[PDB]
């Protein structure tokens, strides 16, 4: 397996991705340990162009661990003020 760094050069504002899951969920639809997952990537959006993929489990956001994060904790981390948005992910 591999850990992968996917970096989104933000115009910031829209990322073009959706997430499901988090530590506050006792299950997810992707792989059986709780976590936050990419559940959607808009085909012509930033995340898609940058190589993000449905099924990616988000491990960290700009260095911040989100393996155990609640859903809202992961949302807050992803919405940090504009920079390159560096996602450490794993595909189970």
């Amino acid at each position: 397996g591999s850990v992968e760094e996917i970096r989104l050069p933000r115009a910031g504002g829209p990322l073009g991705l959706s997430i499901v899951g988090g530590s506050d969920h006792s299950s997810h639809p992707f792989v059986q340990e709780p976590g936050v997952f990419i559940s959607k990537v808009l085909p012509r959006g930033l995340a898609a162009r940058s190589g993000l993929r449905v099924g990616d489990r988000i491990l960290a956001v700009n260095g911040q661990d989100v393996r155990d994060a609640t859903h809202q904790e992961a949302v807050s981390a992803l919405l940090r003020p504009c920079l390159e948005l560096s996602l450490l992910v794993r595909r189970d």
Partner: peptide, 8 residues
Amino acid sequence: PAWDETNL
């Protein structure tokens, strides 16, 4: 079963 999906 259903999971909230947050669009960003």
